[PDB]
Amino acid sequence: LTLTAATTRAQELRKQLNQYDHEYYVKDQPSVEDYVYDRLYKELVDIETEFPDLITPDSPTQNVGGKVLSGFEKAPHDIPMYSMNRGFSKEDIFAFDERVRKAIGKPVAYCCELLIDGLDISLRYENGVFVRGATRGDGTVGENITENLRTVRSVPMDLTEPISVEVRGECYMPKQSFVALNEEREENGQDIFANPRNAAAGSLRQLDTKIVAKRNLNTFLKQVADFGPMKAKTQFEALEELSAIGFRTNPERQLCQSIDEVWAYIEEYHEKRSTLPYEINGIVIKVNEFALQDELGFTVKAPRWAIAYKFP
Ligand SMILES: NC(=O)c1ccc[n+]([C@@H]2O[C@H](COP(=O)(O)O)[C@@H](O)[C@H]2O)c1
Numbered sequence: 001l002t003l004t005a006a007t008t009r010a011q012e013l014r015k016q017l018n019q020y021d022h023e024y025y026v027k028d029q030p031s032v033e034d035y036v037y038d039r040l041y042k043e044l045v046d047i048e049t050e051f052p053d054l055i056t057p058d059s060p061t062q063n064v065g066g067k068v069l070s071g072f073e074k075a076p077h078d079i080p081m082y083s084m085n086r087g088f089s090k091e092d093i094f095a096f097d098e099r100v101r102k103a104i105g106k107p108v109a110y111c112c113e114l115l116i117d118g119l120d121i122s123l124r125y126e127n128g129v130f131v132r133g134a135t136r137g138d139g140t141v142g143e144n145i146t147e148n149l150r151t152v153r154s155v156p157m158d159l160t161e162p163i164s165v166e167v168r169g170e171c172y173m174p175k176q177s178f179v180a181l182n183e184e185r186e187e188n189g190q191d192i193f194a195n196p197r198n199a200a201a202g203s204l205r206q207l208d209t210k211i212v213a214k215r216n217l218n219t220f221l222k223q224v225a226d227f228g229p230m231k232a233k234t235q236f237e238a239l240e241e242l243s244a245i246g247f248r249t250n251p252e253r254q255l256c257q258s259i260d261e262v263w264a265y266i267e268e269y270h271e272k273r274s275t276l277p278y279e280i281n282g283i284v285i286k287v288n289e290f291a292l293q294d295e296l297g298f299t300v301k302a303p304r305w306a307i308a309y310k311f312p
Helices: 003-027 034-050 090-104 175-187 196-204 235-245 259-275 290-296
Strands: 074-076 085-087 110-116 119-126 129-134 141-143 165-172 218-226 254-256 280-287 306-310
Touching: 003 034, 034 085, 085 090, 090 259, 090 280, 090 290, 090 306, 110 235, 110 259, 110 306, 119 196, 119 218, 165 196, 175 196, 218 235, 235 290, 254 259, 259 280, 280 290
Parallel strands: 085 306
Antiparallel strands: 074 141, 110 254, 110 280, 119 129, 119 165, 165 218, 280 306
16 A cells, blocks of 8 residues: 555544544444444554554544543543454454563463453442542543433442452343333433443433433443552452452453464354353453563553453
8 A cells, every 4th residue: 555545544534533433432423333433443453554654633443531520520540441452353362472472481370251342441449448430531530420321230339358459351131131221211212322431321321310310330440540458469369369359350351371372262152142141342462460460551542451352
């Protein structure tokens, strides 16, 4: 591809994607399906990779998420919330691996999890008590949704230990509830949600706590942000320590040594994809040890120690 072609094409792609980002991250009402958005974003990455000069501040590859809504107390994140690099093929995963084993200079162990179609949240605890629930917003300032998150049961008020921490995860709506809700939202004359994620988001990100409580929402915690007294050193460990202290966590997790294991994992759950009561849209491959995650660091937008495969 030529430079003169790229330039004008990137222009098309940035101009489109940032409108979609506004639709999705802000309004929670996307024009286009996800597999499309990923095609167009994947294209733009390739262009900006071939021609790093075309990278601009407002490129989607540079920001995370979107702005905060009007009537919602702001929720600053002392530790940033980031996005995640994506892959779509056997090819792409083996590549990640090779790049990671290069910069680390050895083979290393990955914790595999499922990618839940849900809304990212940040939960903050102090001496065991729940104190603030936050969206991601733009990675550094989200929205205070504490009063709404209270209506979601799997979210504990009191931990099993009187510890001060902050933990990150997804809040999703099960397929059953989802369909009931769209059906529910037709005799009303109201228009549907595109998917469980946008169902979850629209429920959580409005002001009327009473009708949030009428939806069926649930949670899975993925990551520890502020550890406080927590002793976990690896991701697989962390997950058990998250269950230990009283958080819901996805049991489908699997620690994989080699990457044939990882690929087999992805095979397996491609097949079990629609066996599950919640909509899954891919797998998450994380570097297991936290010091290794510290070694690779984050990009501007995402972690280098983690990739998210997407199904076709
Ligand atoms: N309008 C859209 O269709 C739209 C826009 C932005 C993100 N998404 C979804 O969100 C993902 C990216 O979210 P993260 O920022 O957490 O990586 C995409 O891969 C896609 O599944 C969809």
